[PDB]
Design a protein around this nucleic acid. Structure first.
Lengths: 412, 402
DNA sequence: CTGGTAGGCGCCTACCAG
DNA sequence: CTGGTAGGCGCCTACCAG
């Protein structure tokens, strides 16, 4: 019943898109449909950008990599990744000749042995770029290779998940210590944006070979779901990627030449976005909503994640002139990186109560009203998310206010 | 060509010598970019997003899958996605007859999903949803950046980063908008170019005579199309939403109309190759240099230490590096390199890496704070205090923004 | 095509409770 | 004062006869 309130709210406000059946929890978790509407896409982009700054920009010796969405096909009897086949090759064998049974078998066999397949993870792309980046860092360990990109997971249908991956190359001597560093770093990162950071947790695990790792979970209403995995792979995968002379893959550990240990850190950005939507869902606490049996709702997304930083509307006064003021203010805000909802450009009028209820459901951080008073003395009306506040401030100060507000929320 | 060699040595491009040929770079069959090229492409993409969705009126981001539903259309070359287990079953479960194999392949062509070749279908399938968002107010736009898959002349698969804007506008303002976007896109490509004349446009028409245009960059071997703009009309919009036309009508002022569909799509990957070529120039006075535009250059500033105590000198750089990162200024931490090259070797390397500013901290800085600043384009050593470096860099970037 | 009928959108003014 | 709203008006557009 409360799940039906949140998914419905996200659908109504375009955090999510889809039919009612595509919006069930099973469908959302499968990744078989494009889950996000325009506000959800912006939320996921904000989340991705936060991952990149904390995992790449502010980290030492972490470099970006790009790799293809498809990889050379294998002949392993249990490789279940979907294969890419040209329709024109199928049309040739069907329509251009009268194929025998043997030729159709031979065609289908060659499909299995040779055709490309969709990547399941981003790890292979990091391993394949390792020697190139080794030259960049003058062979010095440790360093990392980071990528955000879609991966494919069978579910007769194929789901798509946005994965954020860091592959960390370190001497075995320090691999366990680096694994603990990244685990704490990732757990702190998830928690910093949460209303209820206790709903993010970890649990140690071992893989089929006994290699050590840990997984990160978010406590959804139906149970815990893994959102991140960290593995200490050792140097197994690296030697298989580069068979032959080990001198080509040896890095510098101080003055020691060593084949590095490989740590793999991989998080699900799509599921993470779902988590923050659930985590942000609250009953409204402001006096207008609370003194009402309607039980208004608010999404309290963290300011760094909220897709819409500020909404702009007009109050009483000459509409064309007021819209002109809003337009100049919007352009100033956009130029300084502040996303704006241009409510002023609407031609149907709604009450302030209706307007502020909608903006709370959209997680708008601040609502700004431009009125005939603004035309006289430049004062605008500022209301914070889920409050009854009407703070008067000069329109020339709004930009600096919001810039410092977001900076304050960013390094807290 | 020494340019691709330079981009490989400095890790703009990746790959073996064979996949660094012109035909291999244009095909997109390998991941072409090293770490510096990935950042350059990312800067290009952000600049696209800034000028196409952030500052544009009623342009919204759209999300769509890489997979699209399959159809028996005969003129569709897009790759199909096939379960390896279905193939094993038809081959291994029992002895298959010729007819069952034909039936298997036919059913494959008719029913299997396909990898997108363009971002257009994803924008069309989200049209009705976003129409509710804008309260049916036309015009509005749906925008996405994402990888698409193209058949390449065994047959391989090419991957290209496409930046797409699909513009819905009343069929009466179609040409006025198409012309606006064309000028806006050509100006966009030229803002960052050293030789803006090497970007150009040319008109084109499709199989059924629909108006459009293509943008080109003059590579040394000839022109290559980097962006296409199409006035599609409304055939795909009606085919995407078959049935009642009331559900897809937008509001042209007070008029309810079925919108015209414009498609604007540029090749981000070919775009970064274009700018690498455009930036390649000879160094002035006293070697090569890449003079990428300041908004595009991957490395804004490089930090190094001079003669003196290697201990406390590397300490000041980290305090400065973290300050620059906090204000969105990317930094090459040259002071951690233990090889210790000369300044000539260092500046020649930074020039090849397109580093905008080179900063040197020394014991003169330890006793005062006067760092040594060097510009990529105009190579000379200007002195300035360290507490004004960030502010100088942010204002220099803002100047180059517009 | 010209131009008459009628719906209703967008903006304004004024009045009222708090 | 502030915000909600009832009532008025100028004009665009959709239809249709002619």
């Amino acid at each position: 019943v409360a799940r039906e309130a949140l998914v419905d709210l996200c659908r109504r406000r375009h955090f999510l898109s889809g039919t009612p059946q595509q919006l069930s929890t099973a469908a959302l978790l499968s990744g078989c449909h494009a889950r996000f509407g325009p506000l959800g896409v912006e939320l996921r982009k904000n989340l991705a950008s936060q991952w990149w700054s904390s995992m790449v920009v502010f980290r030492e010796q972490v470099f970006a990599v790009d790799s293809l969405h498809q990889e050379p096909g294998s002949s392993q009897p249990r490789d279940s990744a979907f294969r890419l086949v040209s329709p024109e090759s199928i049309r040739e064998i069907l329509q251009d000749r009268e194929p025998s049974k043997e030729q159709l078998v031979a065609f289908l066999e060659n499909l299995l042995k040779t055709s490309g397949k969709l990547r399941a993870t981003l790890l292979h792309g990091a391993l394949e770029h390792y020697v190139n980046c080794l030259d960049l860092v003058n062979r010095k360990l440790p360093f990392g290779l980071a990528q955000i990109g879609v991966c494919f997971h069978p579910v007769t249908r194929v789901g798509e998940k946005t994965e954020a991956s860091l592959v960390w190359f370190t001497p075995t001597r320090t691999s366990s210590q680096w694994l603990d560093f990244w685990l704490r770093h990732r757990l702190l990162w998830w928690r910093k944006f949460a209303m209820s950071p206790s709903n993010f947790s970890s649990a140690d695990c071992q893989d089929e070979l006994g290699r050590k790792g840990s997984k990160l979970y978010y406590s959804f209403p139906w149970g815990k779901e893994p959102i991140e995995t960290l593995w200490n792979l050792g140097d197994q995968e690296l030697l298989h990627t580069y068979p032959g002379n080990v001198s080509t893959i040896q890095g510098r550990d101080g003055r020691k030449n060593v084949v590095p240990c490989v740590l793999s850190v991989s998080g699900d950005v799509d599921l993470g976005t779902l988590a923050y939507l659930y985590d942000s869902f609250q009953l409204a606490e402001n006096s207008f909503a609370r003194k009402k049996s309607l039980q208004r709702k608010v999404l309290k997304l963290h300011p760094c994640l909220a897709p819409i930083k500020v909404a702009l509307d007009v109050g009483k006064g000459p509409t064309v002139e007021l819209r002109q003021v809003c337009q100049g203010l919007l352009n100033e805000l956009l130029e300084n990186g502040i996303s704006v909802w241009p409510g002023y450009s609407e031609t149907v009028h709604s009450s302030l109560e209706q307007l502020h209820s909608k903006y709370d459901e959209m997680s708008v951080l601040f609502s700004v009203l431009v009125t005939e008073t603004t035309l006289e003395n430049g004062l605008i009306q500022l209301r914070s998310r889920d409050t009854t506040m009407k703070e008067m401030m000069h329109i020339s100060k709004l930009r600096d206010f919001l810039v410092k507000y977001l900076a304050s929320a960013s390094n807290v």
